[PDB]
Each structure stands twice: as structure tokens, then as C-alpha cells.
Curated annotation (Swiss-Prot), chain B:
Segment of the intact protein contained: 125 to 190 of 190
Tissue note: Widely expressed at low levels in many tissues; highly expressed in testis.
Binding site for Zn(2+) 2: C30, H32, C49, C52
Effect of H32A: Abolished E3 ubiquitin-protein ligase activity
Name of protein: E3 ubiquitin-protein ligase RNF4
Gene: RNF4
Length: 67, 66
């Protein structure tokens, strides 16, 4: 069960209390999707995308300039 | 290499040599300038600015304190 209004990780399926009880943080992507710190971390070792919506959540900080 | 010269510190090509074969001039956010080809290469197996070593990979997630 995953009652609406509750904050849990869609990957490990832990609730808010379980996530914080062992030192993990609640995190959010810029695209608004919530995970525990540890599952999003593993996930991003091997992708630039949000587990939930697949939108890229990296930002190589460089860009063309047009002199 | 006088001030105002636009060139790549990696391949050593100047602004004309860069645009003539289809590369773009680029800049990291720390203000460092490369050709698009050399910078891109450097970032395949690394995530730092080839010039100053600052991390230039901004993964867009953060803690929320509830
Ligand atoms: Zn989790
Ligand atoms: Zn997302
Ligand atoms: Zn170059
Ligand atoms: Zn730099």
C-alpha cells in the first residue's frame, strides 16, 4: 500500500520514517520527483535521467558562445 | 596568445581554425574557453574543467527538509 499524501521512495519502497531512521535523506529532483538519497544516488551512477520521468537531470556546465 | 585571443588550450587551434571545420567555441561556467570538440572529449571520462579542475557536472537533485 501507498496511501496518498505519504512521502516514500518509489525504488526501495520505504516510508518517511524508515528512510530517516538509518541516516538517509528525502531528496527531490528538479522535475519534482521524490526519492531517498541512497536510491537516487545509486541510480544516477549509471544514468543522467530521473527514475520516475526519465527527464535528464544532469547539467554539464558549459555552452557555446557566439563571439 | 595575447589577451583577447580566442583559442583552445587543448588542440591549440585558434578561432578561425575552430570555426572553419565545424566546431563551436564554448565556455565552462567558471569562464574557461575551449573548442566544442576538445571539451566534449575531455568530459567523456571525466567531469572537471580541463583548465581549473572545478566540477562542471550539475546533477539536478537536492535534499528536502520535511
Ligand atoms: Zn529508496
Ligand atoms: Zn522526474
Ligand atoms: Zn580544441
Ligand atoms: Zn574552469
Amino acid at each position: 500500500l501507498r496511501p496518498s499524501g505519504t512521502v516514500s521512495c518509489p525504488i526501495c519502497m520505504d516510508g518517511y520514517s524508515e528512510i530517516v531512521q538509518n541516516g538517509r535523506l528525502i531528496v527531490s529532483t528538479e522535475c519534482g520527483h521524490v526519492f531517498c538519497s541512497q536510491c537516487l544516488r545509486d541510480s544516477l551512477k549509471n544514468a543522467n535521467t530521473c527514475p520516475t520521468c526519465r527527464k535528464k537531470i544532469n547539467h554539464k556546465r558549459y555552452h557555446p558562445i557566439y563571439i
